[PDB]
Design a protein around this ligand. Sequence first.
Ligand SMILES: COc1ccc(C[C@H](N)C(=O)N[C@H]2[C@@H](O)[C@H](n3cnc4c(N)ncnc43)O[C@@H]2CO)cc1
Length: 194
Amino acid sequence: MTAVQLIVGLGNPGPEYDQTRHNAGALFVERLAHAQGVSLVADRKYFGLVGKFSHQGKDVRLLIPTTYMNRSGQSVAALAGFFRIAPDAILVAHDELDMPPGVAKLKTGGGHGGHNGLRDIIAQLGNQNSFHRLRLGIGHPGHSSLVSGYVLGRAPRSEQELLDTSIDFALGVLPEMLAGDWTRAMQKLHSQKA
Ligand SMILES: COc1ccc(C[C@H](N)C(=O)N[C@H]2[C@@H](O)[C@H](n3cnc4c(N)ncnc43)O[C@@H]2CO)cc1
């Protein structure tokens, strides 16, 4: 229906934040770029790492913002703005507290749920939330006061492997996602068990 033109992977920059839970989305996009043979170029204009490849005669861009997570929108709006990409043609991959490691789901629209990357993107896109999300489960620590330390921490290896597994499931529906066939992507993805 509407082909995806931009896939954004959320995360924080630098070695300290690499491999942390809040970089799950960035990890998805890095894995996707590697599987597709796409180079991610540092591009100051877009405040991140940008990659491009062609699919069905159209350019699809990959973006990992190198802002801190709470300014991710600045990156997304700079790139979407420049190429005139509507929210409906954007997919944002991100960590999801409300699902355990090993689970990925797709969602169109909705709020940010206290995810400051999502929050900034919604604001920067002109208060538009109708982009698609790839929700990568990272589990929840069990109280609101533990969340900040938890998402900025490195998960136990078992949870990381489960995340890797969910990323693979999601890559398995890339054809559907790229085409904008969310119904099919959802049917295939949400039926998978890690
Ligand atoms: C503690 O020191 C730092 C260091 C770096 C950052 C960068 C970034 N801006 C961020 O990581 N953001 C947030 C939120 O996006 C994230 N987060 C995700 N879901 C959340 C929720 N329901 N409630 C609170 N924070 C949540 O927690 C992270 C750490 O507090 C932030 C804080």
